[PDB]
Amino acid sequence: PVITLPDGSQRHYDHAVSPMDVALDIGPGLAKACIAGRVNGELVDACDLIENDAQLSIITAKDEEGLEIIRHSCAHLLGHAIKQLWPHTKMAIGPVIDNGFYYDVDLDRTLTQEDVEALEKRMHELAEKNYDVIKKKVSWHEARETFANRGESYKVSILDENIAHDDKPGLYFHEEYVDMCRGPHVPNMRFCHHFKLMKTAGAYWRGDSNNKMLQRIYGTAWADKKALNAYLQRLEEAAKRDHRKIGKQLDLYHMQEEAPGMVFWHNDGWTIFRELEVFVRSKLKEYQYQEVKGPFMMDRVLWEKTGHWDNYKDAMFTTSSENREYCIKPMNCPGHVQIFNQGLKSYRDLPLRMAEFGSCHRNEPSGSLHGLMRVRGFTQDDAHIFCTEEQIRDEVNGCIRLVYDMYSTFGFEKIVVKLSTRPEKRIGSDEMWDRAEADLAVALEENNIPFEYQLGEGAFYGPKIEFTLYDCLDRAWQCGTVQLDFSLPSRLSASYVGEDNERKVPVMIHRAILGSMERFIGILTEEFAGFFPTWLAPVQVVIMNITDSQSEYVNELTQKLSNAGIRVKADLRNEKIGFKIREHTLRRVPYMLVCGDKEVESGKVAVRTRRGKDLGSMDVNEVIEKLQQEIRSRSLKQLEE
RNA sequence: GCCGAUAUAGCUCAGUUGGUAGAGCAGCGCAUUCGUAAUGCGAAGGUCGUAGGUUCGACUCCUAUUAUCGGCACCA
Ligand SMILES: Nc1ncnc2c1ncn2[C@@H]1O[C@H](COP(=O)(O)O)[C@@H](O)[C@H]1O
Ligand SMILES: [Zn+2]
């Protein structure tokens, strides 16, 4: 066939060739770097034959794809070893994953951190042998036969219920060991030297909490020892960014055994919270919303009417009086509708935008609590928009804009967008869902927002647009969201009066921009690593003296800053100016004002950043204008940087 | 909720070998009045998450429990 290489060059062969064969033909080096090849776009083992013309490319550890191939092979290496150490182990699923791979295994013996260390040792041993990985395509029968005779019940299920009974599934052979799933594998283990097992945990078979929980063993793997070590290094650096840490170090809040999953906001944490509170408010005024507030508990009936009670009563908290059962609200929808139902609304009142910083309480899974990210009590910055279907487009778009508008103040660079389509269990006609799904989609496109569908998610009453942010270790956390609801306002019997003097049920849009205030603070803390932007900073300025001398000057100096609207505390402790500077820089204070005699009756003040950067002595009234400005504009960077 | 692990002073961390819990920092006391990331000396401090149990003896072993860490599942 004729082969066309990355440089347009062509090569002619009179019989089927493999990318490996072609590799040699090109050079002994490239041949030796070969892991796999990319033929006419698809990825195939370097040993697969290329019958007809094709565009070739050799996959090398330089390739992002090689990396994954390598990681996948290590996953097989683990199976190889694991089976030598405890031959009764059943292999389930072992896939590549970000930074590595894992393997779910059914073993009737709880793997201790000692065993996991024994495994990694055996593992490194087999990989050093540098053996060859051999591929062999076969019938869906001998393949089944193979694993049935090997005792692998799981590989069998996958085989007879996930693979076309009329297939030539390829088996991979690592000396005595055999695995069999797609994606190309390594030529020989010479490429699988750098790797390390990490954690281990239970994982349900096939993701169902009703199935058996197997043991999942996680690992990392790279092309070179450098890359691997830089990774582990990155993990360490990441741990110093965790909000639970910084949170404690900076005294932002705490939680206790007696109120699991409920935050106690200490003064400094609450300053941050109240700050986002005014920030949001300023935005609600622009986009023109009303701000209301409803009760914390309401008669359960309201949740029965919407259907929430049936689908979520076990994740809901309730209370009782002699003659009444209440619900501590899980969300603010029903209560806002209650307000809507107050007078008589006409089509002239729409679109009605009603917002609330509402306190939600949900009884989350005990195993799911996570710092400020996943709590049992939180405050949602949500709002519900009551409008006519004609107004949807315009309204949804308004939301989309508001989201990126706000996230841009914090300079987030990774916002991924999802479109959650109808769940299996929902309410509403299939015509309704198409209406809704398409409306969101279109609004997304009309705004040029790339996104992926997420089949199955989406509230029982409507589809959702989910904006998700990431944390220190790149885990996903849903934040802003937009739901299109055509079913609830009717169950809660809400209506306006149309032109024809007829009653119409409004279209309701549920939307939150930050998500929950606790989870957003969770995210900001890790984004700034505790180095909050002057406007969000608990304490903005610390003014210190060097000796009693300057003290009386420092006080009226700090007082001057307070009357100017700057969160400023005065450090007059009898200690070394160096002891102080260390403290507050550690505590992440943005600006530190120093006062030696040279400043006292000299007017000025000695300004320095927390990044470390003497800005030199400057004019009082000037540092004030300068800060009030940094603040007023909620800027990410500080003075002269 | 599930699998595994962890829980020691205000914080960080020993004692994770059954034979009286021990450090640095912080706090307290005295001294030090100092020019941009930690001043010196001193006297003290927990009863080992909680409840049971085994044991001559338990921080160490066992059970139950609560929370937390790492995942899975869940996430209106
Ligand atoms: N348990 C929780 N803890 C903290 N924030 C949450 C929690 N559940 C939901 N959120 C946030 O609130 C938003 C709206 O939640 P939901 O009303 O369930 O759509 C989510 O997108 C998250 O940002
Ligand atoms: Zn809502």
Residue A187 inside a domain? The answer is no
CB-to-strand B under 7 Å, chain A 316-335:
316, 330-331, 333
Task: Report residue A411: phi and psi, to 5°.
Answer: 55, 35
Q: Which atom of ligand 1 is nearest to the CA of A375?
A: 3
Q: Taken in order A276, A282, A284, A289, is the CA torsion positive or negative?
A: positive
Task: Say if residue A442 is in the same domain as residue A509.
Answer: yes
Q: Is the beta carbon of A478 within 6 A of some atom in ligand 1?
A: yes
Residue A185 inside a domain? The answer is no
CB-to-strand B under 7 Å, chain A 173-212:
199-204, 207-209
Task: Say if residue A305 is in the same domain as residue A336.
Answer: yes
- What tokens appear for A389 in the block? 């279907």
Task: Say if residue A155 is in the same domain as residue A68.
Answer: no
Residue A21 inside a domain? The answer is yes
Which has the closest alpha carbon to A417: A456, A468, A382, A463? A468
Q: Give, using CA atoms, the residue closest to atom 6 of ligand 1.
A: A516
Strand A264-265 and strand A253-254: pairing? Answer: antiparallel
Count structural domains, chain A: 5
Task: State, as a whole number of angstroms, the distance between the CA of A366 and the C1' of B72.
Answer: 13
Residue A47: CATH number of its domain: 3.10.20.30
Residue A173: CATH number of its domain: 3.30.54.20
At A129, which amino acid appears?
A: K
DSSP summary character for residue A603: -
Q: Give, using CA atoms, the residue closest to atom 20 of ligand 1.
A: A515
Q: In what order do the strands lie in the sheet with A591-595?
A: A568-571, A541-545, A591-595, A605-609, A614-618
Task: Say if residue A56 is in the same domain as residue A150.
Answer: no
Dihedral angle, C-alpha A171, A173, A174, A177, nearest 10 °: 80
A365: helix, strand or coil: coil
Q: Which atom of ligand 1 is nearest to the CA of A362?
A: 1
CA A530 to each of CA A179, A270, A379: distance values in angstroms, whole numbers, following the listed order: 46, 15, 21
Task: Say if residue A500 is in the same domain as residue A610.
Answer: no
Q: Give, using CA atoms, the residue closest to atom 17 of ligand 1.
A: A331
Task: Say if residue A114 is in the same domain as residue A138.
Answer: no
Q: Cα angle at A292 between A289 and A293, to 5 degrees?
A: 150
Task: Say if residue A477 is in the same domain as residue A517.
Answer: yes
Task: State, as a whole number of angstroms, the distance between the CA of A547 and the C1' of B76.
Answer: 59
Say which experimental method was used: X-ray
At A190, which amino acid appears?
A: R
Question: How many H-runs (helices) and E-runs (strands) does chain A carry?
Answer: 19, 35
Last residue of one domain, picked from the residues A510, A533, A556: A533
Q: Confirm if A269 and A253 have CB atoms less than 8 A apart.
A: yes
CB-to-strand B under 7 Å, chain A 234-273:
242, 244, 248, 255, 257, 260-261
- What tokens appear for A65 in the block? 């794809």
Q: Please give the resolution of this entry in Å, rounded to 1 decimal.
A: 2.9
Q: Which residues contact A483 (CB under 8 A, 6 or more apart)?
A: A458, A459, A461, A462, A463, A464, A509, A510, A511
Task: Say if residue A123 is in the same domain as residue A138.
Answer: no
CA A456 to each of CA A418, A422, A439: distance values in angstroms, whole numbers, following the listed order: 12, 6, 17
A492 appears as a binding residue in the annotation: yes
Distance separating alpha carbons of residues A240 and A234, to the nearest angstrom? 10
- Per the annotation, the verdict on A80 as an active-site residue is no
Q: How far is the CA of A310 from the centre of ligand 1 (A)?
A: 19
Residue A389 inside a domain? The answer is yes
- Range of the structural domain that residue A489 is part of: 238-533
Task: Say if residue A499 is in the same domain as residue A454.
Answer: yes
- What tokens appear for A55 in the block? 């565009």
